[PDB]
Design a protein around this ligand. Structure first.
Ligand SMILES: [Br-]
Ligand SMILES: [Cl-]
Ligand SMILES: [Cl-]
Ligand SMILES: [Cl-]
Length: 284
């Protein structure tokens, strides 16, 4: 029985968090930590405490994690016969190459702080050079969220994005695969966006959707934007334009991990036996 430390990132509907219940448990999820650290020794120490009868973990660090990726992770743990500790990535980022290192989930895999990363994690070329990805369990285009009767765009090649009018505000999530795509394909656009990019997907959605409006368009994974559109009560949001930058979501492991093939096998079986469809129906 292997024991894996798993890093995740809260992104609806793939992973959500809520507080633990009265008896310190998670009847409909998995106990996780939200410790704001990338120090492997601190995590060891915290999970050691969490498992003991002398649990002195600050409550501010304890959460219940639930969602599509947590259901996936539980099934993998049962089929591969491993148990796991689960924590939320300290910097809240998926990961990018910045100032000579990798940040976010990619960084924790490369430092050995996490054994595996499970969330809506995009497989792209740059990350593929440094970490392993399993077979994908989901696929998504990038998308562009706007208000109804608001900004209209043809897709990522719209001149409004490339020769922006004064005060036209559009951004993406910092240190995501969407930022890496814009940075590598449209350097001048990437520069323009810097002042408008946001730390996390919910921030971009809030800035576009809520008043006072802070963004005119928000670019991020279409699967995530479509979820927000589907729960839009006032039906005042939409996604626009042609597809672009289609990527799979995969589980991340260190390069050349011996676990990758076994997890890929299971993901492929889950897909071919309708489990992905069940998870999609459950969470979307
Ligand atoms: Br729960
Ligand atoms: Cl897929
Ligand atoms: Cl209307
Ligand atoms: Cl940030």
């Amino acid at each position: 029985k292997l024991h894996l430390r798993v890093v995740t990132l809260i992104e609806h509907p793939f992973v959500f968090t809520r507080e633990v219940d009265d008896e310190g448990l998670c009847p409909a999820g998995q106990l996780c930590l939200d410790p704001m650290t990338n120090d492997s020794s601190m995590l060891d120490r915290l999970f050691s405490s969490l498992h003991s009868s002398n649990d002195t973990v600050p409550i501010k660090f304890k959460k219940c994690c639930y969602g599509y990726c947590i259901d996936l992770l539980e099934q993998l743990a049962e089929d591969m016969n491993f148990d796991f500790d689960l924590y939320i990535v300290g910097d809240g980022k998926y990961g990018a190459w910045k100032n000579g290192h990798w940040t976010g989930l990619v960084g924790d895999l490369l430092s050995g702080t996490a054994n595996m990363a499970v969330t809506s994690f995009s497989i792209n070329t740059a990350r593929s050079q440094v970490i392993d990805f399993t077979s994908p369990f989901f696929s998504t285009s990038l998308g562009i969220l706007v208000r109804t009767r608001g900004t209209e765009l043809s897709g990522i090649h719209d001149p409004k994005l490339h020769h922006p009018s004064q005060g036209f505000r559009f951004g993406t999530v910092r240190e995501s695969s969407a930022e890496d795509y814009v940075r590598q394909s449209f350097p001048e656009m990437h520069e323009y966006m810097r002042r408008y990019n946001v730390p996390a997907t919910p921030d971009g959605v809030q800035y576009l959707k809520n008043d006072p409006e802070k963004l005119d368009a928000f670019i991020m994974d279409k699967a995530l934007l479509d979820y927000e559109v589907s729960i839009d009560a006032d039906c005042k949001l939409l996604t626009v334009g042609k597809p672009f930058a289609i990527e799979g979501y995969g589980i991340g492991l260190p390069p050349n991990s011996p676990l990758t093939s076994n997890i890929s096998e299971l993901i492929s079986q889950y897909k071919s036996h309708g489990f992905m469809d069940v998870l999609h129906d459950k969470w979307y």
